[PDB]
């Protein structure tokens, strides 16, 4: 009414305005939620809380690391609910070594239990995941000189890296209990440079067209 | 008897013409 | 036939509850409370949901000139005014259908493209421009519509005085109905072919042992449900487009009355109605509340309203 | 772990011998001040919108 | 911060010129910007405003049509082309930088000033002179003649103060909000028409010419002065 | 000596329960069952704060009870007119993961927090124009869970590293250091007289610091589950906490017990916010069943629900006169009832 | 009226389609 709060309300409109620019400057920019080691390996494959910004082919990306979080992930994985994708870092050498971090129990049996959590939580009942099933080279020579039972004691011995490595992709997307509705995109890491990047691109870019079509009432 | 145009002329002029065909 | 008038009267009311209720919940869901206007779908769906909502309040005045046989007891004003609200709510509707179309292929298109890419450039330049469009291709149904008394009784019969080539438009009516027909479902079925089939196109083209949920399962949905909106669109659209044809065809050349339009227009032309606003019951269901961002609402609020 | 344990001990011994009124003179006191204060409460009782900065 | 101007100088009537301040310190494009002229020998008078954003502009009745305003937000600089000079736009033409949000401070930095010679609401000061000395009391009245009391609870009255040469410097943006970096000793009290302006501990830097002006409707009136002398 | 220092813990956690048993002779619900109820007061809602495009973690009310502060995962710090809906100021982020946020008292300053594990302090008043950090605090191993401004240079801070501190802004540094929980802490409350905090944490712990010497003079248990949102009662003498086992509960000071327990058969769902009403009468917690109930904090009857949110209700607070309750929620809208 | 007429001229002699034009 008054002069003043009429160049205050023209104050706020400015403000709403710029706010609305930045909201849909960020709307198509993909989130990224990295959890897992072989993180530093993939956060430098295209290359408190850790976020690195690259871009990949005419599209901006944010990849967040929260490791150095050692709190209760019940108390903060509700801020990551709405990201595009979530990426699984899993060593593959990791399965003749124990003492994840100082008990008994081995690795890739901690691995399968957080990607069990991440999963199946009622936060990423949308969000796909990809998995990066990273230490293929050292793999190579641990499946010979000791064989897959150690981590696993139901297994039908067959050591030859073809089908192993199989084996542990295909209990990892067992893990997954709300099929048909989240896609768990798995990629060897190969050290090729260029190769990361772009599958996942290609998944990011999957699971954008499925959302589109969500938000048009199709799929 | 004498008269046998009933109801058609008007069916047929509101079929050939009219709203309710729009 | 002699309870037949009863039955068309019934299914017209019928029609018109079932519709009217589904119009109102479907606006009362995503707008009373949800209130999204964001995106561009969600707008068209509301003005799709009041267009259809009119059209299929329109009926129950066809369904009384139905139930006194022929008899239309009604003034010569509203007469003007449903026959307009009628034809305006056939474009309207159709239109929204065809723009509804149009922005699913360009949402699924420009997708990757986030700094790349009359025509439907703005969301709010075209949803009151096809609005205006779907009136003034109905204006002639109000300047027209000459109601006559002609046996102690007054129907809502359109007549076009004028002699500027002949005692009717063209020929006869003419224009007034080919502009139905043509502009209200060739070119937009046309569009929705066209754009429907180019999306599951597109969707097939990037990666159509297929696995089942993320490659097999997107098409074999995208497809069913474009499928489905179509055939629904078509099938609820073509008796009554078939029968304006024939009617135009008899006030034409080859002009054989010989029953053979007759019975067309006694019995399949009231069903033929009844699809074209069932059609408007079909569509809020289609489009606002298959969407799960709907259906929560309608849960939410079925706890919130009453018990 | 002595350290903890003995910490812990300290905190308990210098947390257990502190005064304590009773439950009765504090639901007393609590019920005073809400009967003090109730009559300056909008929230409680509603304002007049005459008097009311966001109507 | 600073608000450097120029461009004045000696033009004949019906002439045109045109005056440019530029921003240096603060966030110039948050800012709108006023236009203030100071005629040789009497008070101050408002000429425009532009808002932040360059959406709102307004002009006094004197300028309508002759006088306009602009911003370049990217240079940092604000213009005035005047067109049609007469004499009665001589004056020294300040640059005055107002924000405005809740607990604003509006009309808070001056320019320097820029001499150019060419060859509503009434704010009364009955006052013209009060013989003051250092160490006492002074007050410093001011009548209006609509009131300034909104229904917002806010009375849209501020305080200026000219030494004998410098810019203006605002003292109470509303009827009692006292500015930034002035003394405790300054204070203001009124109900709706009646103001005044107390000085408890005068001294030598507090003598000057002191001005009220309203912020209530759009042009935007200063009083004729009051000044102090020692 | 392990097993005698365990021994005696366990013997003086005894202790404590038996003089805690002894002075409770009576209830608070036995003494106010005479009391009149409250009624049933229906606020309705008055503004609607439009302009974050994300959920809303914190909002904080200035001493003003006209301005307030609201945090947002959108990366916005928005300063809001509630009178008049404007917007006074939106602080740009360098973090967008917000958890808290606070109001200074003098208003001058702002605070902010989250998952970068800093409390940014932004300077309001500035001469230039706009609004800028005047300080980043940065000694704490987890993420900031709630912060309050003591005065206009000191700020007490809790975080998920099991620590709350007591910071100096001139100088950036922590002048005391609170420890003793076992688990993250969650909220914080700061007294009237701002000489006693209580900061409850996930171990289902309340307990009460002394902000002069250092020390945690006395510890509340009583809660299932991990408490989410503390609040001091009006006079300083008691305070209560929403937790996620779907229970409030009152605790005394001057007791060193739980009063009431403010908990119903049908909310089965964690509370986020709570807070008291100027005179200690109603408490008003928000739930992740999207909405808020008002209790009565004498008598733990529910006389109303401000149901107005489509997501979790997670930031709550009352104005200093008591006139408005402003709610903050997930679907990105701040509301003021009355 | 004009559609009786129309009428007794159609069903005693026949339809010319030519009354009905202003008719319909």
Redesign the interface.
Known sequence: ????????????K???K???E??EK?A?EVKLLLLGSGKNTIVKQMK??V?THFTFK???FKMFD?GA????RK??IH?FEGVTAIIFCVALSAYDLVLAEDEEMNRMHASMKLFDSICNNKWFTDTSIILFLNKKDLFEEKITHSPLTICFPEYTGANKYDEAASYIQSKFEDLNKR???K?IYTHFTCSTDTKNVQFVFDAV??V???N??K????? | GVRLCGREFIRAVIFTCGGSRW | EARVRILISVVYWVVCALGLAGNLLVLYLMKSMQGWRK?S?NLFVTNLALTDFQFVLTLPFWAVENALDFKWPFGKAMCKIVSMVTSMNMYASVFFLTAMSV??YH??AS??K???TSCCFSAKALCVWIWALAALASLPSAIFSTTVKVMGEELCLVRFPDKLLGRDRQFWLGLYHSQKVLLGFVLPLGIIILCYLL?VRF?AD??AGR????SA??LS??TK??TIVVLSFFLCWLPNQALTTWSILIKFNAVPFSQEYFLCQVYAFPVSVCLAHSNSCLNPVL?CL??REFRKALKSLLWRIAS | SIAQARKLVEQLKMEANIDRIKVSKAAADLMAYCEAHAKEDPLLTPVPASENPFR | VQLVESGGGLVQPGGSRKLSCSASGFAFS?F?MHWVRQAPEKGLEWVAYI???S??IYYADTVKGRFTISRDDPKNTLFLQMTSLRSEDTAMYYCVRSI???G?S?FDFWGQGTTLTVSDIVMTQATSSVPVTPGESVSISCRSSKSLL???G?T?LYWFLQRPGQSPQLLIYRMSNLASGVPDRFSGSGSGTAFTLTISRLEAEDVGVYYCMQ????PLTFGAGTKLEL | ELDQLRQEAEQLKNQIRDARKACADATLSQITNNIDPVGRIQMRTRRTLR?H?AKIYAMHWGTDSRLLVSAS????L?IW?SY????V??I?LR?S?V?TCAYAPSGNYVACGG????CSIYNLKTREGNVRVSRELAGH???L?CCRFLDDNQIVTSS??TTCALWDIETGQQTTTFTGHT??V?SLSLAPDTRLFVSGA?DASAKLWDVREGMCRQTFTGHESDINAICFFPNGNAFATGSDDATCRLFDLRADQELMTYSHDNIICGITSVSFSKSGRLLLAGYDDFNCNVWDALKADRAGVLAGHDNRVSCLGVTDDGMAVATGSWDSFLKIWN | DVLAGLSSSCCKWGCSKSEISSLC
């Open positions: 009414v008054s002069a003043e709060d009429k160049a205050a309300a023209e104050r706020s400015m403000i709403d710029n706010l609305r930045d909201g960020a198509r408190g809380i976020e005419d599209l901006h929260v979080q050692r709190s209760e108390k903060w801020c099929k048909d509705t896609e870019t999957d954008i067209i499925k589109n079509l938000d048009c009432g199709l799929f | 995106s779908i922005t699913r949402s699924v997708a990757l986030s700094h790349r999306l969707i990037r990666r696995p089942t949920g993320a399962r997107r949905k995208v449900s474009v489009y298959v969407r | 948050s709108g808002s932040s954003g959406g709102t405005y949000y809740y604003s509006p909104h229904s917002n806010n849209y912020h209530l409707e759009y | 302009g495009l995962q959108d990366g916005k928005i007119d008049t809906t404007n917007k100021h939106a740009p973090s993961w958890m998952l970068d594990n800093i191993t987890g993420y869970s998920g590293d688990g993250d969650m996930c």
